[PDB]
């Protein structure tokens, strides 16, 4: 089939929900380390300093196991975001790569927080038809 | 066998010379419009502001028919660069996307200038092994 294309994810719904999948791309998953499980459309210039521009497809490996300093896809009360991880105990900080955005601070005690996957790369094609 | 990968190209040797081919990636060429013909490793942060980063693989359509405004791969006297085109006569101006970088001015009389192709996308993957 190929790598699914997850666009904007409705609140509550899982990422790979059938009505979020706007295509399947024939990219060799193992070109990414670890494997690309899906491609998520980046929305925002929250990450532009490292080259994750709006409309980019992020290559994501589906895991909850991510270490600090890594770019993660996260959910904060149904807000699928792409930031860098700095967790200190119950203090999870989702840092952006842009001087116009301020960090997201999450207290695991208060907010519901899920790591959806690891950023393993970027595919930037446009519209191809 | 899919898109070839070209790194440092030899001074005065074709870009897709076997010696420069650092591998063949299985990516759907037609995921890019127009078709990606090859991938070139990007050297330097000249284009950091459009999202083209050092080490990125630029998806390039092999052509010479490029119009002003486009991002192109160009060879200026044995050096290959990825820049935005602004040709006005025998004065071609290869513009960057980074304030720390200054436009290149090629004088078609004095130096050799070829257009290798058109930038049609970007793949950012790492070493995968």
């Amino acid at each position: 089939e190929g790598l699914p294309l997850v666009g904007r994810v409705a609140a509550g719904e899982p990422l790979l929900a059938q009505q979020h999948i706007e295509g399947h791309y024939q990219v060799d998953p193992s070109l990414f380390k670890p494997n690309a499980d899906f491609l998520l459309r980046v929305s925002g210039m929250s990450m532009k300093d490292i080259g994750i521009m709006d409309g980019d497809l992020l290559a994501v490996h589906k895991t909850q196991d991510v270490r600090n300093g890594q770019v993660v896809v996260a959910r904060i009360d149904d807000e699928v975001t792409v930031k860098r991880l700095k967790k200190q105990g119950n203090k999870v900080e989702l840092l952006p790569e842009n001087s116009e955005f301020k960090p997201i601070v999450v207290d695991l005690r208060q907010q519901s927080f899920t790591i959806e996957g690891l950023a393993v790369g970027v595919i930037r094609n446009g519209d191809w038809l | 066998e899919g898109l070839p990968l070209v790194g440092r190209v030899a001074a005065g040797e074709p870009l897709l010379a076997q010696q420069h081919i650092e591998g063949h990636y299985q990516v759907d060429p037609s995921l890019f419009k127009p078709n990606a013909d090859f991938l070139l490793r990007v050297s330097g942060m000249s284009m950091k502001d459009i999202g083209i980063m050092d080490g990125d693989l630029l998806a390039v359509h092999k052509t010479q028919d490029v119009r002003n405004g486009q991002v192109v791969v160009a060879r200026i006297d044995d050096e290959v660069t990825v820049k935005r085109l602004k040709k006005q006569g025998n004065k071609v101006e290869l513009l960057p996307e980074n304030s720390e970088f200054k436009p290149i001015v090629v004088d078609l009389r004095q130096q050799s200038f070829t257009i290798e192709g058109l930038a049609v996308g970007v793949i950012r993957n790492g070493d995968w092994l």
Partner: nanobody
């Protein structure tokens, strides 16, 4: 239990060819990528060549179209034909692999081989 069985190497003189081979055996769910690294005395380990199951290949600078990595998915084996060996190519060549063992479904791990010495002389 999974393993990288290496096969080949030794010495040649300059411009000499040498076939390397490496297979992965055991409780494997998925081979994501196999290939070869190398270590020269004093210097660090560098990638030589890599191949995925779909046929994607990557090579380092120093291989200028003189090496060719290939695979037999049914034999879980990869082969590297090195062709125009230079004295700069002398090193231990460790087969490396990215494998999901069926032990740990979904997680991949790095696996290494014993190391085979390639020596190029004059």
């Amino acid at each position: 239990q999974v393993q990288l069985v290496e096969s080949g190497g030794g010495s040649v003189q300059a411009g000499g060819s040498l076939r390397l081979s490496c297979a992965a055996s055991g409780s494997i769910f998925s081979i994501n990528a196999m290939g070869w690294y190398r270590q020269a005395p004093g210097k660090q380990r560098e990638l030589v060549a890599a191949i995925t199951r779909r046929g994607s290949t990557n090579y380092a600078d120093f291989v200028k179209g003189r090496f060719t990595i290939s695979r037999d998915n049914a034999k879980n084996t990869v082969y590297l034909q090195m062709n125009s060996l230079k004295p700069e190519d002398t090193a231990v060549y460790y087969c490396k692999a990215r494998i999901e063992p069926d032990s740990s479904w979904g997680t991949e791990y790095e696996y290494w081989g014993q190391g085979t010495q390639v020596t190029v002389s004059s």
